[PDB]
């Protein structure tokens, strides 16, 4: 509960291999002390010899660590000096060409903010490495009752060209001078507000009020769920179709579950080290923690349970029951599109910019956030089918003449209410067009043309499911050819998406696994059982996702299809939750190889 965990929590995740390695030293010391021979059953000269050999070993490995740190610091400082040179040249060119321009100035501001972050990270690297050297040499002096630890400290650590190099501080002062004089016209307060680096990473605890709101929204949600179960068992009339209600309130529940599991994903990413901040292109000084996602999910789930309770109980008699789902989803939309600057404005508007860039996406260049949201829409595809069902049910099947709305006595439609398939492929279509744009952009046909057929398989599956459904409904003859076609495309799609999940979405099953059998070379999440359980769960849940797609866009199994979809949709959201972890880990391990901790803000 000291500098070991302080170091693990304050490490820049992409430079983890180039830190002090505190715990290795600690274990070395404890094992040396443990296997020390006797003091009177053995010879004292042998004890002196053993302790001298351990001291030699300890100081050899300490010299190795110091050399590693010096090398890394020199490389990073040279890189920062080059980056400052090119940034000053860019600013000089832009400002003398000044005598569009707003975009140029915004990109220059952003590039100077990322250059400052790298300097702050290198400074924190220096500080942590020096404090780790002092603490571990102190532990060596304490365990062995000697003074060679502090001797080695004063002799070697405080001469090293990483503790005596006051060159990062000059760079920071120079950067502040540049940003204040040339970009802000004085006004150092505004420059430093843009440049100041809050304690980031796992090194910040969420405000107590956010955690209290998480706990408050969770307790209300829990009690309202108990109340919903009790009101479903004891208050719902036993002569009405509750299935329209289930279908209407199914999408909201999937959204709440997705936000909860996204909060858990953010917690796992922040703890294991894989920084979604650099991958999603979020600014490192302000992110949403897992607490904020939990709070959003809890609030929306509170509203969901309140609307469902109002449907079951019918509190006031003037307003019919169909207003409650409408009200719930209208508030959900008004929360997202809130034009004022309140209730997570930056997050909501980043999400809206992303949604405009994924729903119109043969034209925008694909980033990681444009790809992750279009991949997450594949799991939240029952939400779009729920929206389509709500529109169809309110337009064609609601009476509007009786207060008893969503729950009708007995009546149906042709199927359930063509355009129930198209709205299943919609996200597959978005991802297909995005992969095509990525191929056109990078001209690399392997990762992009493959992974475009991955969603064409979904296209074909839905098409042939619908064809066989309509042909068995009207009792035709060429229905069997279509059943075999659907089964072959179901198998093809399940294996295609399954191989892509494990191979080049998670990185698993590579030739250089090593001792992590069937896994990557370097794993980030602690337990190895996490990965094997994830593999098994994805194998199970990937196959029971194409079945749901086939049964949601069809007319077969009318009575059991709805139970199937209701049970399998949260399972698919859980599958996406599991997939997020290892996709983000695989993406972060790319950034670990090039030691990239800050984004490369281009400017033109």
From Swiss-Prot:
<keyword id="KW-1003">Cell membrane</keyword>
<dbReference type="GO" id="GO:0009615">
    <property type="term" value="P:response to virus"/>
</dbReference>
<feature type="topological domain" description="Cytoplasmic">
    <location>
        <begin position="274"/>
        <end position="286"/>
    </location>
</feature>
<dbReference type="Pfam" id="PF03105">
    <property type="entry name" value="SPX"/>
</dbReference>
<feature type="binding site">
    <location>
        <position position="454"/>
    </location>
    <ligand>
        <name>phosphate</name>
    </ligand>
</feature>
<feature type="region of interest" description="Important for inositol polyphosphate binding">
    <location>
        <begin position="135"/>
        <end position="142"/>
    </location>
</feature>
<feature type="transmembrane region" description="Helical; Name=3">
    <location>
        <begin position="287"/>
        <end position="314"/>
    </location>
</feature>
<dbReference type="GO" id="GO:0015562">
    <property type="term" value="F:efflux transmembrane transporter activity"/>
</dbReference>
<feature type="binding site">
    <location>
        <position position="375"/>
    </location>
    <ligand>
        <name>phosphate</name>
    </ligand>
</feature>
<dbReference type="GO" id="GO:0030643">
    <property type="term" value="P:intracellular phosphate ion homeostasis"/>
</dbReference>
<feature type="topological domain" description="Extracellular">
    <location>
        <begin position="315"/>
        <end position="320"/>
    </location>
</feature>
<dbReference type="GO" id="GO:0016036">
    <property type="term" value="P:cellular response to phosphate starvation"/>
</dbReference>
<dbReference type="GO" id="GO:0005315">
    <property type="term" value="F:phosphate transmembrane transporter activity"/>
</dbReference>
<dbReference type="GO" id="GO:0005886">
    <property type="term" value="C:plasma membrane"/>
</dbReference>
<feature type="binding site">
    <location>
        <position position="576"/>
    </location>
    <ligand>
        <name>phosphate</name>
    </ligand>
</feature>
<feature type="topological domain" description="Extracellular">
    <location>
        <begin position="558"/>
        <end position="559"/>
    </location>
</feature>
<feature type="topological domain" description="Extracellular">
    <location>
        <begin position="476"/>
        <end position="478"/>
    </location>
</feature>
<dbReference type="GO" id="GO:0001618">
    <property type="term" value="F:virus receptor activity"/>
</dbReference>
<dbReference type="GO" id="GO:0006817">
    <property type="term" value="P:phosphate ion transport"/>
</dbReference>
<keyword id="KW-0472">Membrane</keyword>
<feature type="transmembrane region" description="Helical; Name=10">
    <location>
        <begin position="560"/>
        <end position="598"/>
    </location>
</feature>
<feature type="topological domain" description="Cytoplasmic">
    <location>
        <begin position="1"/>
        <end position="205"/>
    </location>
</feature>
<feature type="topological domain" description="Cytoplasmic">
    <location>
        <position position="444"/>
    </location>
</feature>
<comment type="function">
    <text>Inorganic ion transporter that mediates phosphate ion export across plasma membrane. Plays a major role in phosphate homeostasis, preventing intracellular phosphate accumulation and possible calcium phosphate precipitation, ultimately preserving calcium signaling. Binds inositol hexakisphosphate (Ins6P) and similar inositol polyphosphates, such as 5-diphospho-inositol pentakisphosphate (5-InsP7), which are important intracellular signaling molecules involved in regulation of phosphate flux.</text>
</comment>
<feature type="binding site">
    <location>
        <position position="378"/>
    </location>
    <ligand>
        <name>phosphate</name>
    </ligand>
</feature>
<dbReference type="InterPro" id="IPR004342">
    <property type="entry name" value="EXS_C"/>
</dbReference>
<feature type="topological domain" description="Cytoplasmic">
    <location>
        <begin position="361"/>
        <end position="365"/>
    </location>
</feature>
<keyword id="KW-1133">Transmembrane helix</keyword>
<feature type="topological domain" description="Extracellular">
    <location>
        <begin position="237"/>
        <end position="241"/>
    </location>
</feature>
<comment type="similarity">
    <text>Belongs to the SYG1 (TC 2.A.94) family.</text>
</comment>
<keyword id="KW-0597">Phosphoprotein</keyword>
<feature type="transmembrane region" description="Helical; Name=1">
    <location>
        <begin position="206"/>
        <end position="236"/>
    </location>
</feature>
<feature type="transmembrane region" description="Helical; Name=8">
    <location>
        <begin position="479"/>
        <end position="506"/>
    </location>
</feature>
<feature type="transmembrane region" description="Discontinuously helical; Name=5">
    <location>
        <begin position="366"/>
        <end position="399"/>
    </location>
</feature>
<feature type="transmembrane region" description="Helical; Name=2">
    <location>
        <begin position="242"/>
        <end position="273"/>
    </location>
</feature>
<feature type="transmembrane region" description="Discontinuously helical; Name=9">
    <location>
        <begin position="526"/>
        <end position="557"/>
    </location>
</feature>
<dbReference type="Pfam" id="PF03124">
    <property type="entry name" value="EXS"/>
</dbReference>
<feature type="binding site">
    <location>
        <position position="455"/>
    </location>
    <ligand>
        <name>phosphate</name>
    </ligand>
</feature>
<feature type="site" description="Gating residue for phosphate transport">
    <location>
        <position position="545"/>
    </location>
</feature>
<feature type="binding site">
    <location>
        <position position="542"/>
    </location>
    <ligand>
        <name>phosphate</name>
    </ligand>
</feature>
<feature type="topological domain" description="Cytoplasmic">
    <location>
        <begin position="507"/>
        <end position="525"/>
    </location>
</feature>
<keyword id="KW-0225">Disease variant</keyword>
């Amino acid at each position: 509960m000291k500098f070991a965990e302080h170091l693990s929590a304050h490490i820049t995740p992409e430079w983890r291999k180039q830190y002090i390695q505190y715990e290795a030293f600690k274990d070395m010391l404890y094992s040396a002390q443990d296997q020390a021979p006797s003091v009177e059953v053995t010879d004292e000269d042998t004890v002196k010899r053993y302790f001298a050999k351990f001291e030699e070993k300890f100081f050899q490995t300490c010299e190795k660590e110091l050399a590693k740190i010096n090398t890394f610091y020199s490389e990073k400082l040279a890189e920062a000096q080059r980056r400052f040179a090119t940034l000053q040249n860019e600013l000089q060119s832009s400002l003398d060409a000044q005598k569009v321009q707003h975009r140029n100035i915004k990109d220059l501001k952003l590039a100077f903010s990322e250059f400052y972050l790298s300097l702050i990270l290198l400074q924190n690297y220096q500080n942590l490495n020096f404090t780790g050297f002092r603490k571990i040499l102190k532990k060596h002096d304490k365990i062995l009752e000697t003074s060679r630890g502090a001797d080695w400290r004063v002799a070697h650590v405080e001469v090293a060209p990483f503790y005596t190099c006051k060159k990062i501080n000059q760079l920071i002062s120079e950067t502040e001078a540049v940003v204040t004089n040339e970009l802000e016209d004085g006004d150092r307060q505004k420059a430093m507000k843009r440049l100041r680096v809050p304690p980031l990473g796992a090194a910040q605890p969420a405000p107590a009020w956010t955690t209290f709101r998480v706990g408050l929204f969770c307790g209300i949600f829990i009690v309202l769920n108990i109340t919903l179960v009790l009101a479903a068992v004891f208050k719902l009339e036993t002569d009405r179709s509750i299935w329209p209600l289930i279908r209407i309130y199914r999408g909201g529940f999937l959204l709440i579950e997705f936000l909860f599991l996204l909060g858990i994903n953010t917690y796992g990413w922040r703890q294991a080290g894989v920084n979604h901040v650099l991958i999603f292109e979020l600014n490192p000084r302000s992110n949403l923690s897992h607490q904020h996602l939990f709070e959003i999910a809890g609030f929306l789930g509170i509203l969901w349970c309140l609307s469902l309770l109002a449907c079951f109980f019918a509190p006031i008699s003037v307003i019919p029951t169909y207003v409650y789902p409408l009200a719930l989803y209208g508030f959900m939309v008004f929360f997202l599109i809130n034009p004022t600057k309140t209730f997570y404005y930056k997050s909501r508007f980043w999400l809206l910019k992303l949604l405009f860039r994924v729903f119109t996406a043969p034209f925008h260049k694909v980033g990681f956030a444009d790809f992750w949201l279009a991949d997450q829409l594949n799991s939240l595809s029952v939400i779009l089918m729920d929206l389509e069902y709500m529109i169809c049910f309110y337009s064609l099947e609601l009476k509007w003449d009786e207060s008893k709305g969503l729950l009708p006595n007995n009546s149906e439609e042709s199927g359930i209410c063509g355009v129930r398939a198209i709205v299943q492929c919609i996200p597959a279509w978005l991802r297909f067009i995005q992969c095509l744009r990525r191929y056109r952009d990078t001209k690399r046909a392997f990762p992009h043309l493959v992974n475009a057929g991955k969603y064409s398989t979904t296209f074909f599956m839905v098409t042939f499911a619908a064809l066989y459904s309509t042909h068995k409904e009207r009792g035709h003859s060429d229905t069997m050819v279509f059943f075999y076609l659907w089964i072959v495309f179901y198998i093809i799609s399940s294996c295609y998406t399954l191989i892509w999940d494990l191979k080049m979405d998670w990185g698993l099953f590579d030739k250089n696994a090593g001792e992590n059998t069937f896994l990557r070379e370097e794993i980030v999440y602690p337990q190895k059982a996490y990965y094997y359980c994830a593999i098994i769960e994805d194998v199970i849940l990937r196959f029971a996702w194409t079945i749901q797609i086939s049964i949601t866009s069809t007319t077969l199994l009318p009575h059991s299809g709805d139970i199937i979809a209701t049970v399998f949709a949260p399972l698919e959201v859980f599958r996406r939750f599991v997939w997020n972890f290892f996709r983000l880990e695989n993406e972060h391990l790319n950034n670990c190889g090039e030691f990239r901790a800050v984004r490369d803000i281009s400017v033109a």
